[PDB]
Amino acid sequence: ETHINLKVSDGSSEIFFKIKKTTPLRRLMEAFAKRQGKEMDSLRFLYDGIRIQADQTPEDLDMEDNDIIEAHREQI
């Protein structure tokens, strides 16, 4: 899609790296799951507090250029 940087934020899981693709939804999908996913104890995908994202839209990534989302915890 586009060459931009990605930044996954979470409780204690915070990783920042550059990627050759804006698509965050797909990015964080692994990225975040690459840092926190290790514990697979967090399955809360949101941006603020309404299961939202930054550029989770394939129509936004094509435009905007900034992959960043939050991965909260959700496993009782």
Domain ranges of the chain: 1-76
What kind of experiment solved this structure?
NMR
CATH number of 1-76: 3.10.20.90
In angstroms, what CA-CA distances link 37 with 31, 60, 63? 8, 25, 28
Q: Which helix (H) or strand (E) holds 28?
A: helix 24-35
Q: Is residue 63 classed as helix, strand or coil in its secondary structure?
A: coil
In angstroms, what CA-CA distances link 44 with 48, 53, 62, 64? 11, 11, 25, 23
Radius of gyration (Cα) for the chain, nearest Å?
Answer: 12
Cβ–Cβ under 8 Å, residues 75 and 43: yes
Cβ–Cβ under 8 Å, residues 37 and 44: no
Q: Is residue 26 classed as helix, strand or coil in its secondary structure?
A: helix
